[PDB]
Design a protein around this ligand. Structure first.
Ligand SMILES: *[C@@H]1O[C@H](CO)[C@@H](O[C@@H]2O[C@H](CO)[C@@H](O[C@@H]3O[C@H](CO)[C@@H](O)[C@H](O)[C@@H]3O)[C@H](O)[C@H]2NC(C)=O)[C@H](O)[C@H]1NC(C)=O
Ligand SMILES: *[C@@H]1O[C@H](CO)[C@@H](O[C@@H]2O[C@H](CO)[C@@H](O[C@@H]3O[C@H](CO)[C@@H](O)[C@H](O)[C@@H]3O)[C@H](O)[C@H]2NC(C)=O)[C@H](O)[C@H]1NC(C)=O
Ligand SMILES: *[C@@H]1O[C@H](CO)[C@@H](O[C@@H]2O[C@H](CO)[C@@H](O[C@@H]3O[C@H](CO)[C@@H](O)[C@H](O)[C@@H]3O)[C@H](O)[C@H]2NC(C)=O)[C@H](O)[C@H]1NC(C)=O
Ligand SMILES: *[C@@H]1O[C@H](CO)[C@@H](O[C@@H]2O[C@H](CO)[C@@H](O[C@@H]3O[C@H](CO)[C@@H](O)[C@H](O)[C@@H]3O)[C@H](O)[C@H]2NC(C)=O)[C@H](O)[C@H]1NC(C)=O
Ligand SMILES: CCCCc1cc2c(o1)c(N)nc1ccccc12
Ligand SMILES: CCCCc1cc2c(o1)c(N)nc1ccccc12
Ligand SMILES: *[C@@H]1O[C@H](CO)[C@@H](O)[C@H](O)[C@H]1NC(C)=O
Ligand SMILES: *[C@@H]1O[C@H](CO)[C@@H](O)[C@H](O)[C@H]1NC(C)=O
Ligand SMILES: *[C@@H]1O[C@H](CO)[C@@H](O)[C@H](O)[C@H]1NC(C)=O
Ligand SMILES: *[C@@H]1O[C@H](CO)[C@@H](O)[C@H](O)[C@H]1NC(C)=O
Ligand SMILES: *[C@@H]1O[C@H](CO)[C@@H](O)[C@H](O)[C@H]1NC(C)=O
Ligand SMILES: *[C@@H]1O[C@H](CO)[C@@H](O)[C@H](O)[C@H]1NC(C)=O
Ligand SMILES: *[C@@H]1O[C@H](CO)[C@@H](O)[C@H](O)[C@H]1NC(C)=O
Ligand SMILES: *[C@@H]1O[C@H](CO)[C@@H](O)[C@H](O)[C@H]1NC(C)=O
Ligand SMILES: *[C@@H]1O[C@H](CO)[C@@H](O)[C@H](O)[C@H]1NC(C)=O
Ligand SMILES: *[C@@H]1O[C@H](CO)[C@@H](O)[C@H](O)[C@H]1NC(C)=O
Ligand SMILES: *[C@@H]1O[C@H](CO)[C@@H](O)[C@H](O)[C@H]1NC(C)=O
Ligand SMILES: *[C@@H]1O[C@H](CO)[C@@H](O)[C@H](O)[C@H]1NC(C)=O
Ligand SMILES: *[C@@H]1O[C@H](CO)[C@@H](O)[C@H](O)[C@H]1NC(C)=O
Ligand SMILES: *[C@@H]1O[C@H](CO)[C@@H](O)[C@H](O)[C@H]1NC(C)=O
Ligand SMILES: *[C@@H]1O[C@H](CO)[C@@H](O)[C@H](O)[C@H]1NC(C)=O
Ligand SMILES: *[C@@H]1O[C@H](CO)[C@@H](O)[C@H](O)[C@H]1NC(C)=O
Ligand SMILES: *[C@@H]1O[C@H](CO)[C@@H](O)[C@H](O)[C@H]1NC(C)=O
Ligand SMILES: *[C@@H]1O[C@H](CO)[C@@H](O)[C@H](O)[C@H]1NC(C)=O
Lengths: 747, 747
């Protein structure tokens, strides 16, 4: 049994990260090809650390310890080591005597201020070299010395990242093999005609954050004198004929030279965020030179102190024939009129329009249907009313998550109006819109009494997000015009639900013949009007977490005893976070017999009636994590032949009954972590049959490592293929001389 | 080392199929959850076959042997057996005493004519039961007796397949749990009001092939008397409110009762192929009752002997608001005019139109751009000119592969004009078309001299399929108007290439700045005009199989010695099937130094100069399978530190040199199957280092199983994680007493 790592198997990974290791383990399998030792407490690497492990092609030593001392030549023996990750190790230098086999080396987030021939010029197979984020913001550090011609040797180098270092000039003598060159936030003020003249293979150039626009910066930001623009020679990009990505965000551009793009016939992504380009947006010649451009980001180009009535888009936007996505967040303007987006309306592939964070107060919605074919109309975070801190592997200037959840966007055209002030829905709000399938009205503080007409103009919504509002369910016909609805999210509408004296009608749920997923979480539901039962022939999943089943199922009240029984198709039910101390037997018995997955985690349960599992013959997963359960039934084998996964972590169990690990015929995964087990008896292991488990989780119990643990230790050896994860965290609490050892120590 | 099965690891599969096993192996790992024993020579199953293997949830015994004798209660001990596959085993009955744990049982393609309570009524957890294809066509077999109420017990049954059995009537007493009911080709002539009256959960109903349309059938086909229609009671489908799929193909329908669909508000797929519905296509009321229908298949509804001028589509097609795909193959008509498809033109989601196999002679192509948004215009196999045999798990009436290759369709709008008679391209052929990205002109016997203007009206093609034509490359500007082209398929244009006295100009390949993949296979290329070199800065993959490099690289001719050198970006090169007996050193040396993958398989090579691998430092895969190589270099370790996979199966190698399995630092996968190895020496195994292999293939060598094989056998035990597949086929050829044993036998 592999220790302290967990092995996964076109290569074999030893997962050994975040395990408190104070040394490289000397027990790595000889068949391992990738070794992850990140996030431990390792302080020395030498030539003995990985002795003879010639199958290792990748080693991850990021974030050690929690500086890392690597001797000269420590890795030199590894003849096929290709990838070495040494991020966030407080290194003062590039380690010497690295193996010539390397194709990827990462030294991100260290204290390296000297890039030398001695450290890298021998690494002639290098393909990707990451040196970003060694000297930046208000760190105490030195300007980076790049030894003249250090990279010139590296004739296979395709990616070089030097961002977030103090460089002052583009390094000379770069190899023409480069494809991707990242020089963001390097304090370069001037790009010469010579800087990139031989980089005829380059596909990506990142010059962002040189002469930055520092107003309202979320980091320590140092502008060029006067807040001046980066200075880019007219001929700087003359031979960059392979460029697809160009990042000039936060370079304090006021002017774009259209002829910069004369010899980039492939440019596909242009990032121009956080500049001063309102004037170029209105009249820019560069827009005519980009007929293959797919993504244009012009976000945060606002004029400080200016709140113009309208956005001013050049007619030359009509020449962006391949455009797919246009991001215009943070331009800052009051009203969007149809005439204002005329230049975009014939572009055949413009599918995403992003107008987030513009403080727009009014939109002429009819305009969107006159575009050729929008699929994402993203208007989140405006003012519409009724009609180390930075991840070095992510984008610095924006989030990269999808604008609209993929599960909602998969249904078809999407309109996102979240985080505005559309506090009620008037009879004309959705007039003249495309056939919207995905609608987001989250966080509009909406208090509407939905009554069956409000979405009549967009009646084919399939995924509706009404979260974080204050909906008032006073009318049983709410939402019944949406006949095709499949997903409804009503999470965080507690406002009226918490008030006993107003009405709460959830009758409408029965009207949907296509509804599959319903989220009622965090509504503080404790009382309903007239009809006490939820009913649906179609619903498969109900999330009811964060409500008050403790009240609904109070022992003095019989009204809600079948609240979910009428969800005749239900397979997944989440009752977590409902303050439950015990469930009435009759209420448990009235849960739908169709259930396969039942979550009751994070309640306060001291009692569970196991016998009632006899009435759920399709139940595969039962989650009771995070409760106060003091004991387990001794008869689970009599109550289920379907249960596959039983999650019981974070309870107060101190004894495992006879047969618990063997007798349930279908049980594969049993999580008993973070309970109060001191031992596991022989009788628990085996009765008439032998275990069918494939995973048993036990970390965080106070095991007693006397000879009384001997039967379980022998059982572990007889049953190697029962995975017990985190053996390093399956720790003797006693006796004193064994405290802190994994139970897997001692004999 | 697991034998005779190969183990793969949320479950562990023992792959044990097609290994000539004459008995269930008694060596299955106790941790195995799915056991595949299909396609062996097993003839008996008893209660000893799977004794104690309580982790088995799935067993596949299909196609044994190559009848299978299963004793009463043989599987009864397995308490969690869920899936049992027993297809094509010549069973005369349902096995008795099957385990109550079963949720899936397949008895497809047996000799079972009796469905009895004794066999199935105890299986109350069954969810899917397959009994199809036990009595059909001209098999000698009996009508199926279904014991009254046999399925009524099965209150969890969701899928029941009885197709291709002689049933005569729908069985009574079906459980209302059913979701999918397949009764294709069951000789049922009449559907009563009672037949499906309680099936309120049904989503799929398959009644195809009852009262079949037998003209030109590719199987023995028995029509209803007179060729009459199936007889479906008006109220037959009255309660099938959950139906999404309805298959009435080949039921000899002339009339569709529109009110059959009155209570199917969810119907999504309607299959009506091989009927007599020309009159209903022209005027059918049913088209108004299907506003959620996505796929309509009306293929092969032609009137025998009739070749009308035009197709006649009802205006009611305009009511099919959700339609995505319309299949109208085999209607048979002469000309497609714009007025004829008016009813389809406003449907917003109609993305696929399939008019295959109509013998259409003329098309008004401008019509397609007036649809709302077609993405697949499939006109393959028409007459346009210049302007057991059946897989029981597939569809019986059509192929299910995508109409257009997904790699071509991923680029955008697709027009497939393959298998017509467009034998030259005139100046107006592609006028008035949408912006086509994927164009298929395969198999039009096209002899055009392409000259740089023929695709001017559709200049943004990205994936062009010109295979199986007779292109005449007399003009160096061919195809140069397609500036965005990324994939070009010129396979099987040997016609003019085989003629020495006509010109062959391939200069144009250099003009494409986006070209990634070029297929020149099967062109019999042996001579080019003026320029002897292929050149491209962008190309990554060239397929040159099936040409005459043997001639191009003849020792008396220096003209083609750098033919591929100018493909400066190339990583994948396929030179298979070029009749090569030896490659000139200088020609091998002139292959691009960028190569990662090089295929020279299926030539006639007796010589390979291994030393020349020193000039390919990115080479990862080398494929030399299917040649005549008599020996291997002894120095491969000196010639490469990049080679990962070396494929040498089907050559004539009889000795492995010292260090072959250990000394190449990067070599992981070595295929030496089907050579003439008698032994593997100690020195081959290990020299300064020890093996880095993770896979070694050795099946089909004539091994000598004397004590001289002892060093290799010990090495196999020391190196368990070097996978040697198919140990059953790694067979002693000698001595006589060991012949036929796996080398893994004997000590
Ligand atoms: C409707 O609009 C709301 C508000 O814009 C969307 O809420 C946002 O949803 C995203 C995506 O899930 C949340 O980001 C994620 O958060 C977690 C951190 O807890 C992280 O694991 C992910 O990496 C990701 O960043 C975001 O915080 C949340 N914003 C707010 C204010 O709640 C919602 O997704 C939209 N609905 C649809 C259907 O698109
Ligand atoms: C309200 O309840 C729904 C239903 O549970 C929540 O949406 C669901 O959120 C889960 C993630 O918690 C999604 O599952 C995940 O899907 C991703 C992408 O396929 C997968 O990679 C993950 O491993 C996991 O399976 C699930 O798809 C999603 N369902 C739908 C219909 O969107 C929703 O987030 C809840 N709302 C609030 C405000 O919490
Ligand atoms: C352009 O049109 C031609 C002719 O219609 C297409 O050729 C056809 O391609 C399909 C798909 O690959 C072939 O089917 C496949 O064949 C093999 C059997 O060898 C099988 O492995 C697959 O399961 C599949 O059935 C088909 O035989 C072939 N037809 C002919 C007459 O050659 C071609 O794919 C079209 N090109 C594009 C880009 O879509
Ligand atoms: C002419 O040469 C091209 C380039 O090799 C051939 O198309 C390629 O065919 C291979 C299959 O042999 C495709 O790879 C396969 O892709 C599928 C789907 O992703 C994957 O599941 C398989 O495991 C395998 O990777 C490859 O995608 C495809 N390339 C393109 C650009 O379509 C083409 O078939 C050849 N033409 C003739 C007539 O043989
Ligand atoms: C996103 C741009 C930062 C400068 C700015 C503009 C505005 C705000 O902040 C800001 N915080 N609120 C506003 C409210 C109405 C109109 C303009 C703004
Ligand atoms: C696909 C329909 C089978 C009956 C049929 C019609 C025709 C053929 O076969 C057939 N084989 N060739 C034809 C040529 C021109 C017009 C009609 C046909
Ligand atoms: C680094 O570790 C080595 C031993 O591996 C030790 O001799 C040396 O003192 C350490 N270096 C520093 C700067 O602490
Ligand atoms: C530049 O790219 C080409 C492919 O067109 C390639 O052959 C060349 O090796 C690259 N340049 C280098 C490695 O300097
Ligand atoms: C629009 O997108 C489609 C699908 O990706 C592509 O085929 C087409 O060439 C694009 N049109 C333009 C003008 O780029
Ligand atoms: C709609 O779009 C077209 C361009 O496709 C434009 O000419 C026209 O002015 C727009 N119509 C309206 C009403 O804005
Ligand atoms: C709900 O609102 C509708 C539309 O206003 C109204 O006609 C109906 O009477 C109300 N429904 C109730 C009270 O159930
Ligand atoms: C909602 O469903 C009930 C049947 O349970 C029906 O009485 C009611 O009319 C439906 N309401 C609407 C507006 O469809
Ligand atoms: C029950 O759920 C499944 C899965 O979503 C669905 O196929 C079926 O239509 C549902 N049943 C009903 C009556 O709506
Ligand atoms: C379990 O539930 C049933 C009532 O439904 C009862 O017979 C048995 O007493 C229960 N156990 C407990 C602890 O209430
Ligand atoms: C079932 O598999 C587990 C490993 O997942 C193994 O330890 C156990 O012995 C097996 N049980 C039986 C009865 O074979
Ligand atoms: C089937 O095999 C059993 C032994 O397992 C044997 O007794 C019996 O004769 C066989 N049945 C037939 C019909 O051959
Ligand atoms: C019919 O489907 C429903 C879901 O709406 C389900 O509750 C019921 O169990 C199914 N019918 C059966 C099992 O007979
Ligand atoms: C058309 O398809 C889209 C995307 O799948 C879907 O949102 C929409 O509802 C469909 N329109 C109709 C009329 O079915
Ligand atoms: C084009 O399509 C529309 C329906 O969208 C139809 O009314 C019109 O008649 C068609 N035009 C031509 C020229 O066929
Ligand atoms: C190829 O054809 C073009 C168009 O016909 C013609 O103008 C040109 O002269 C020819 N190109 C040659 C012979 O290279
Ligand atoms: C094709 O490429 C060559 C340069 O190698 C150039 O002479 C020729 O003009 C190009 N032809 C066309 C039609 O673009
Ligand atoms: C070489 O190939 C890669 C992968 O397709 C591509 O990124 C690059 O553009 C190519 N180089 C040239 C010069 O076209
Ligand atoms: C391998 O190639 C080179 C010539 O390029 C030569 O030195 C050596 O003789 C060659 N070996 C054979 C067998 O030709
Ligand atoms: C490398 O891994 C193989 C299994 O893939 C193993 O048999 C061999 O002993 C390993 N070699 C070394 C040097 O550890």
């Amino acid at each position: 049994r592999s220790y302290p790592c967990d092995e996964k198997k076109d290569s074999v990974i030893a997962e050994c990260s975040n395990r408190r290791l104070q040394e490289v383990p000397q027990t790595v399998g000889k068949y391992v090809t990738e070794l992850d030792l990140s996030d431990n407490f390792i302080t020395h690497i030498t030539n003995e650390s990985f002795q003879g492990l010639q199958n290792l092609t990748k080693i991850n030593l990021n974030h050690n310890p929690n500086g890392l001392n690597i001797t000269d030549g420590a890795f030199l023996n590894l003849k096929n080591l290709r990838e070495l990750l040494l991020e966030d190790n407080q290194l003062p230098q590039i380690p010497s005597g690295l193996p010539e086999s390397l194709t990827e080396l990462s030294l991100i987030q260290n204290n390296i201020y000297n890039i030398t021939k001695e450290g890298i010029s021998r690494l002639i197979n290098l393909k990707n070299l990451y040196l970003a984020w060694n000297c930046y913001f208000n760190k105490v550090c030195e300007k980076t010395n790049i030894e003249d011609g250090v990279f010139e040797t590296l004739t296979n180098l395709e990616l070089l990242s030097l961002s977030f270092n103090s460089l002052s000039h583009v390094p000379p003598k770069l190899p023409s093999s480069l494809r991707k060159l990242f020089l963001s936030n390097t304090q370069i003020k001037y790009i010469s005609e010579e800087d990139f003249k031989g980089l005829i293979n380059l596909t990506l150039l990142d010059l962002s954050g040189n002469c930055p626009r520092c107003f309202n910066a979320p980091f320590p930001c140092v502008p060029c004198d006067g807040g001046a623009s980066i200075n880019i020679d007219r001929f700087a990009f003359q031979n960059l004929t392979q460029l697809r990505y160009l990042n000039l965000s936060s370079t304090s551009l006021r002017k774009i030279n259209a002829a910069w793009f004369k010899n980039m016939p492939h440019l596909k992504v242009l990032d121009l965020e956080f500049n001063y380009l309102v004037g170029e947006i209105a009249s820019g010649a560069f827009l005519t030179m980009l007929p293959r451009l797919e993504i244009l980001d012009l976000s945060f180009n606002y004029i400080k102190g200016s709140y113009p009535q309208h956005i001013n888009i050049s007619r030359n936007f009509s020449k962006l024939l391949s455009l797919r996505a246009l991001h215009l967040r943070g331009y800052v303007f009051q009203e969007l009129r149809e005439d204002d987006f005329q230049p975009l309306m014939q572009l055949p592939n413009l599918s995403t329009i992003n107008l987030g964070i513009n403080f727009i107060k009014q939109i002429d919605f009819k305009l969107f249907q006159n575009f050729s074919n929008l699929e994402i109309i993203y208007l989140s975070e405006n003012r519409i009313s009724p009609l180390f801190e930075f991840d070095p592997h992510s984008n610095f200037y924006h989030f990269t998550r999808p604008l609209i959840k993929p599960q909602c966007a998969a249904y078809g055209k999407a309109l996102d109006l979240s985080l505005n002030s559309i506090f009620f829905i008037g009879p004309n709000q959705f007039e003249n819109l495309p056939d919207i399938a995905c609608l987001n009205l989250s966080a509009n503080s909406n208090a509407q009494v939905l009554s069956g007409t409000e979405f009549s103009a967009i009646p084919h919504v399939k995924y509706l997000d009404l979260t974080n509002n204050r909906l008032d369910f006073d009318n049983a016909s709410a939402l019944t015009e949406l006949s095709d609805l499949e997903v409804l999210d009503l999470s965080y509408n507690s406002h009226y639900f918490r008030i006993a004296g107003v009405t709460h009608h959830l009758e409408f749920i029965q009207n949907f013949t296509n509804l599959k997923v319903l989220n009622l979480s965090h509504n503080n539901i404790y009382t309903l009007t007239d009809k006490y039962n939820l009913e649906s022939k179609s619903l498969v999943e109900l999330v009811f977490s964060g409500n008050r089943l403790d009240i609904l199922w109070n022992d003095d009240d019989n009204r809600y005893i079948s609240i979910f029984k009428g969800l005749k198709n239900l397979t997944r039910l989440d009752l977590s976070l409902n303050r439950l101390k015990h469930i009435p037997n009759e209420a448990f018995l009235n849960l739908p017999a169709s259930l396969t997955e039942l979550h009751i985690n994070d309640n306060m349960l001291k009692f569970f009636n196991w016998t009632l599992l006899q009435q759920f013959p399709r139940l595969e997963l039962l989650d009771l994590r995070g409760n106060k359960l003091l004991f387990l039934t001794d008869s689970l084998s009599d109550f289920t032949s379907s249960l596959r996964t039983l999650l019981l972590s974070h309870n107060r169990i101190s004894h495992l009954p006879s047969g618990f690990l063997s007798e349930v015929s279908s049980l594969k995964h049993l999580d008993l972590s973070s309970n109060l087990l001191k031992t596991i008896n022989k009788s628990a292991l085996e009765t008439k049959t032998t275990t069918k488990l494939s995973m048993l989780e036990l970390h965080g119990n106070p095991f007693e490592c006397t000879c009384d643990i001997g039967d379980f230790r022998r059982w572990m050896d007889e049953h190697l293929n029962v995975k017990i994860p985190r053996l390093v965290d399956v720790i003797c609490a006693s006796p004193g001389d064994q405290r802190g050892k994994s139970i897997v120590s001692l004999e």
